[PDB]
Design a protein around this ligand. Structure first.
Ligand SMILES: Nc1ncnc2c1ncn2[C@@H]1O[C@H](CSCC[C@H](N)C(=O)O)[C@@H](O)[C@H]1O
Ligand SMILES: Nc1ncnc2c1ncn2[C@@H]1O[C@H](CSCC[C@H](N)C(=O)O)[C@@H](O)[C@H]1O
Ligand SMILES: C[n+]1cnc2[nH]cnc2c1N
Ligand SMILES: C[n+]1cnc2[nH]cnc2c1N
Lengths: 291, 291
């Protein structure tokens, strides 16, 4: 067994303290172990991001514009969590594909069947005005050309919608597939537990203060760095059993999930953080139909 | 006579302490009083910007990419000033129009007859590499659509060329001609002495630290503000005779120019700042053929 003792898990990209040369043979290795693991991945990352906005007093009364939301099965849990907490939020879910019918029949959530473009963003902004907007993007076309195209759309989402905070899908193109240096919004690179086995994807979390917009250039050397750091995280780290983690499941991703869940607010009062986490996790797994 | 006593002139936009409702009748008023006043305007603003980079140790060894440089008569003075100072700089002047022949025959300055586009910027960056780039843009197509188009090109100049500092042409579109909110690079809004009588134009001066790029949104309300502040500066301020300004010329623009010229470095040592300024001004006017 691959046992280890850790204080805390890597929460953000910069925390990764090591790197490994990427082995193309890892692509042939099992990417997932849990059913609906993709929804789980999304649900934790988005509960984490949103509970933070709550902490900063910017969630209540906002409209959450989720682009690339279908099927969005896990969004029903998020919606319920904050609704039962008393937070007022309107959800506007937009995708060209169809949403999980469990999202229908709620006055607070609007489902839109449209692939967004810069023009469409302009009209929703006019229609959402003067409400405060929180943006979540999970759009997917892939080629480095597809990526750049997605990243270029997400930057336009921010400039047109002018959100108070944003969660964006972020995976650096692979160095050996570089095309050109590009800019991405400045934010925290939140690492994702339950991401596919060798995924280099994270979520770019940002809060907008003032009327400024800070971007950051991404170069090929940066692309090499992402690859080695994420390859070390995936191959080595995520494969560890954290023995000093007293929890029903000691695998790294559960240790990592625990740290995200401990930040979530609840109505029920608990004697320990472990009590809360076990509860939220149980709750989350039952909702998602994960054994 | 319109006399007044001032401590210092308004150097940047934010310093303007008042505003006036714009009178469309001012457009019918004499825009210039000095021959080659446009070159004078450009020469001071660019000497000021560049002497600053010198102060920060970022001028020497750089290539100054000037886009929108023709005829560029005044660029010959700038070139000579820093060359005679011992600063090593290559000048790359690019415009589709023709440059003043006084710029030919200098190994340190390259004249390019090309209207730049995003593609061309990419090739010059590849060819200029690995040299440090300082960008100066003075491109002009006008309509608010022309403006946005120019501003959109200038932002691409920065992202592709990735300069260490930039001077950009900046004039906000008029509120009654608003089309849409847009982003501009973050920088100091340097005010321009000898600008046309009712010009709302300034130069956006920026120094790039780290690999970050900070932008700032410009809205219609911002556009209203620019108009009233610049209208107050032009109609009232620039029309003042600064009596406590002991200088051969006490008009505001000369008082304003003095403050810019006092920042310029010289080989000759002078007993007073007035001695230096008189010298540089005399020198500048003789070069430009301004009485
Ligand atoms: N321009 C665009 N606008 C909206 N949705 C888009 C889009 N381009 C791609 N998409 C959507 O991006 C999605 C990527 S998968 C999204 C999964 C979703 N976040 C969930 O919780 O299950 C696809 O449904 C695709 O239709
Ligand atoms: N894409 C582009 N590339 C280069 N020059 C451009 C341009 N679009 C416009 N221009 C130039 O922008 C200039 C504006 S006037 C520039 C004056 C110059 N800075 C001087 O010191 O005298 C015109 O010469 C025009 O040809
Ligand atoms: C996940 N993943 C997949 N294919 C690649 N090619 C190069 N790097 C990678 C990577 N990290
Ligand atoms: C200079 N100038 C010219 N035309 C305008 N129309 C509205 N504002 C202006 C302005 N400042």
């Amino acid at each position: 067994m691959d046992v280890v003792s850790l204080d805390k898990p890597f929460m953000y990209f910069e925390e990764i303290d090591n790197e490994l040369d990427y082995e193309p043979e890892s692509a042939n290795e099992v990417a997932k172990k849990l059913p609906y693991q993709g929804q789980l991945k999304l649900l934790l990352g988005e509960l984490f991001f949103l509970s933070k906005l709550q902490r900063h007093g910017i969630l209540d009364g906002a409209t959450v514009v989720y682009i690339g939301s279908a099927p969005g099965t896990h969004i029903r849990y998020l919606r319920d969590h904050f609704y039962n907490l008393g937070v007022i939020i309107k959800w506007m879910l937009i995708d060209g594909r169809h949403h999980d019918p469990i999202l229908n029949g709620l006055r607070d959530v609007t489902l839109v069947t449209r692939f967004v473009d810069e023009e469409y963003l302009r009209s929703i902004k006019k229609q959402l005005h003067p409400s405060k907007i929180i943006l979540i993007s999970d759009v997917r076309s892939p080629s480095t050309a597809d990526l750049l195209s997605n990243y270029a759309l997400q930057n336009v989402m921010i400039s047109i919608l002018n959100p108070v905070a944003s969660s964006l899908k972020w995976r650096c193109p692979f160095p050996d597939q570089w095309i050109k240096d590009f800019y991405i919004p400045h934010g925290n690179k939140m690492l994702q537990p339950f991401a596919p086995s060798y995924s280099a994807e994270m979520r770019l979390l940002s809060i907008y203060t003032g009327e400024n917009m800070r971007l950051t250039r991404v170069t090929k050397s940066d692309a090499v760095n992402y690859e080695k750091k994420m390859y070390y995280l995936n191959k080595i780290v995520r494969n560890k059993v954290v023995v000093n983690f007293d929890y029903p499941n000691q695998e790294y991703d559960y240790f990592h999930m625990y740290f995200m869940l401990r930040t979530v607010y609840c109505n029920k009062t608990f004697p320990t953080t472990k009590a809360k986490v076990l509860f939220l996790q149980q709750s989350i797994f039952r909702f998602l139909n994960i054994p």
